[model samples]
Target chain A: MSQTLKQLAMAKMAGFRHKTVVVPEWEGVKVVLREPSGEAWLRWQEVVKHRNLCADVVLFIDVLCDTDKQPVFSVDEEEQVREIYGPVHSRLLKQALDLINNAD
Target chain B: SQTLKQLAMAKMAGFRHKTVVVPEWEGVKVVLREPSGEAWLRWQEVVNVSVSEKAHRNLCADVVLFIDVLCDTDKQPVFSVDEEEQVREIYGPVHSRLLKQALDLIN
Candidate 1:
């Protein structure tokens, strides 16, 4: 096994960035945000386009996680999130999106 | 006035460049730079276990980074994206070391 290949694969997995943001509306509760990989984004776009569903709801479900890195919403829970989705959720998702895309 | 696209392109111009003497290659000097985030994303696209062996995938991915960052004396890219396979053909310890050195500039 090549060490370079192992190192590169490790690096790619490590790139699935996780960040934490304080939710003031939740009285300073910390919410973890996960960045989707490029491959995941491709899968996401196809799924959302096929369903004619809003993309942000799908993205929100995947990216919002707990401090332990577990997703807050499951794949099948998209409808519940959409029902509760409001300006607050949008702003929270926006924060998560910004945290991920803050490319340096 | 610059559009957001124009502004983003202009900001990418800030990528830094450096020149180092590679003794393994007969002491020939080569230029390298801080790899761009765009190139990094492309690397992730291929550095996957599903597509091939992890090592081969990484080899291709790192080659992509090297092709983008490695430069000629005039600061022009020495290898084009089309030459990825050719670059990978010769990639090994010395090249990996230099590529790491180049990547370290940003990290």
Candidate 2:
């Protein structure tokens, strides 16, 4: 009630989504996936704009979080992820991405 | 202040006001204010279109923004929403220069 329209524009909203799922590839461990913040999305957008198709791992690592909603992998570990990324990772990533499109 | 409150305050601080004198307009002064959050949203939506339609969309958005920021000596908007077409017809490279000056305050 105390906020103005200008204040609302720059303010961060809870638009990001989170989901928990058990991945059989990870020995049936439950993984917490989160939607990237606007800052992270912009970084991914920049990579896409530059026509790099291998940047899916960047967004995948961004969405992979711990139980406390903290990121599981640091950006520095992107190469490690790229080394082992496959259809399994793609499936999980698609599920995480679906959260964005389906959320009203 | 709290975290979110501080962020909101930081953003609100950037919506500034200024008076610009245009030599092309015979030194006629105009009051310009930063776009509000709602107006910015409106501006952005107008720009979301296909690449082929980008020029037309940008003109529409620019006209919307120009009407929002360009004010008179009394700090009132010189053009109403219904006068957008009239404003668009007169808008040209010079208005773009003026708009650029107005938007530069953001940085």
Candidate 3:
């Protein structure tokens, strides 16, 4: 995932907790949050006209984030992350996180 | 003014809308104003359950209250009484966007 996508997801989670989630257009992507309760699902569309960008965020989280560990998705879940977001995104996330941490 | 046909053409500049089918779910549906202002309980169905007039009224009131809390409006009611009439015309009583987008996808 890109840094921008991470920020967007974080903001979404924050708004979701506050029950004030708004579907915003991010980098040509239209993000929609569905029924916030049990089995909440988020759909991200890369383009207004394309449905292929409509990916299930819950499925990604389920397959990537380790269920038994911390409440948040962390670096340890790299393998599962690769499985869910694909190798490209997995690597991108790692690089982005690494660069941010190294700057400290 | 653009005719209905012309409006349709204008709407479909680059993307084509088609119809798609989905399984049914049991729940109330909320309709919201554009630009994200208010929400209203457009419709509700209790699947295989009968509801009394009082119970129906209570449910509507509950939905309205929920919408009221979510919206910024002070005077506007949460649920619209006329929404039910509009809901009956569509199959499954889901949101218009859901119906139209499904149709668009299938087409």
Candidate 4:
């Protein structure tokens, strides 16, 4: 095509992109996770506003899902969320949040 | 005398010919301009919940709106990255009307 510049820009469109959160506390298995986005951020803000910062971490992570966009745990899976205990909880969240904050 | 493909290429450089209107306040909204590559990159630099306790900081919102808000009318500022706060405040409270409305539209 004579329009090389236009074609060049279009060819580079694959720009949007990622990390899969993993925790072994649930039994050393890799559980697929989804970073909270959009409306979920509102829910996250509520948890942070009321409860301690840690309170939101567990809830935010709960939106984790598999390839099908299905929840990896029960929505608000308090039972499974139980595994993301206190000590390692902050650590794990730091790691994941690292990816998100740096995700640009 | 432009072919379809060439026209599409020119479309990429077009500075927003569309918009989203939200029925929030007295006709408040933003131009549907595409956030630039630098905006996206700057967004990452700004919103890092991991770096601090206040991860979802207000500045993060400002950074986003700064990049996205083209204007309330046919003409909106798109390059005043440093003055995002001025605009954000001139508009209204955080996440109330303008922020949420602009975010809802451009976001």
lDDT score for candidate 4 against the true structure = 0.45
How many clashes show up per model? 0, 0, 11, 2
Evaluation by TM-score, superior candidate among 3 and 4: 4
Q: What TM-score, computed on C-alpha atoms, does each candidate reach?
A: 0.45, 0.46, 0.19, 0.41
Better of 2 and 4 by DockQ: 4
Better of 1 and 4 by DockQ: 4
Best by DockQ: 4
Task: Flag the better candidate by lDDT, 2 or 3.
Answer: 2
The candidate, 1 or 3, that scores higher on lDDT is 1
Displacement of the residue A54 alpha carbon in candidate 4, Å: 6.0
* Steric clash pairs (candidate 2): none
Per-residue lDDT of B1-107 in model 2, one digit per residue for the tens?
49877866762344587878766555667767777777788787886532212333466688678777766656666667777765654554445566677777776
Query: Candidate 4 residues B1-107, lDDT tens each?
Result: 67876866774344443554534332344454545666656665665244334444544654464446444344454436765543322322222233344444334
Q: In order, what lDDT does every prediction score?
A: 0.62, 0.63, 0.27, 0.45
State which candidate, 1 or 4, has the greater lDDT: 1
lDDT of 1 by residue, B24-70 (tens): 45456677788878788888797522111233346668778877877
DockQ of each: 0.02, 0.01, 0.01, 0.03
- What ranking emerges by lDDT with the best candidate at the front? 2, 1, 4, 3
Per-residue lDDT of A41 in model 2: 48
* Model 1: colliding residue pairs: none
Q: Write candidate 4's Cα lDDT for A71-99 as tens digits.
A: 55554565456555465655555454443
Itemize residue pairs with steric clashes in candidate 4.
B49-B55, B70-B76
